[PDB]
């Protein structure tokens, strides 16, 4: 079986993070930016879905 091409993502950066590490103060909320790029030169993705998932 031979499919069409498929693209890739790389997690170009995150704004207020360093090596994907950060602290909270147990009650304060924060927010930041995630920068992702589509490495493919031809294909364009028409679906994205984000599921947060945690240690507990």
């Amino acid at each position: 079986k031979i499919l069409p091409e498929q693209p890739q993502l790389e997690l170009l950066s995150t704004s207020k993070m360093t090596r994907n590490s950060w602290m909270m103060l147990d009650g304060t909320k924060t927010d930041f930016h995630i920068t992702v790029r589509n490495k493919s030169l031809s294909c364009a993705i028409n679906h994205i879905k984000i599921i947060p998932m945690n240690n507990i």
Binding site: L12, S13, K16, T18, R19, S21, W22, M23, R37, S40, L41, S42
Partner: protein, 286 residues
Amino acid sequence: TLDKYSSEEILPSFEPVYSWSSSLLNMRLRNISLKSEHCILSSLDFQTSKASEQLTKKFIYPQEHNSFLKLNFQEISYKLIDGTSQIELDPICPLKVPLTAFSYDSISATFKLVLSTQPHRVKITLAYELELHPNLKLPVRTSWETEVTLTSLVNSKLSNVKFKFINSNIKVIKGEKFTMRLQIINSSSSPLDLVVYYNNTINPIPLTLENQYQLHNKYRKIAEGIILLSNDYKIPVVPPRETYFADLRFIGIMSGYYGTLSGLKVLDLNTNELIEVGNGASVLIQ
């Protein structure tokens, strides 16, 4: 068809049938990387070559004492290739793509693109036309492919702890107390008791006077330009595989650009290191 051929062979006369016995412009690409922004600036530059000067007085306008060419660039295309794929890449500043040019000219175009172990493949295509007289024009459609081939984060020696400021670049008016959050990522084996301090002491100089006083002024500016309102801070505990925010408070008293500010050096009170974390700050006080 040996049978049908040998049966069409013309038998000789008087013999039994069978006998048992017996390049107006030259161009290059001087790309440069930038780890500060994780991006590479690929700058092509094409200039009218010496062949154009040679042919100026030979065929184009031999009778004139000083002639010049009329190369009109119809399009300058920069593209990225991945196999059959092909995508254009725009420049930083606008470029008036129907660009007229004469002899002894040189034009540069800089294209920014994201930066490890996967070199890029770039096609540069120049379509232009030499515009000898108003009526006739000689077009050219040259193109060629190649590959895009060619500090803020600070580590600790004899350990794995890592340091970075949340805002390495900050500008603030002189005399206003500000703050820079120093994140300290510990992941090695055990908690640390590292202590931050800033020494406002003129470091002794070790050379002509021109170098000597430059160097002395550098240490003086470093020593008594900025102060830390929380000097000799005891960072309480940073357990293994955790981070801490050593929130520092400063204030400047001498306007300038303290790029990679020294003096500020956190020392580990576990093996008597002198890890210089000041390199991750680039304060500018007006």
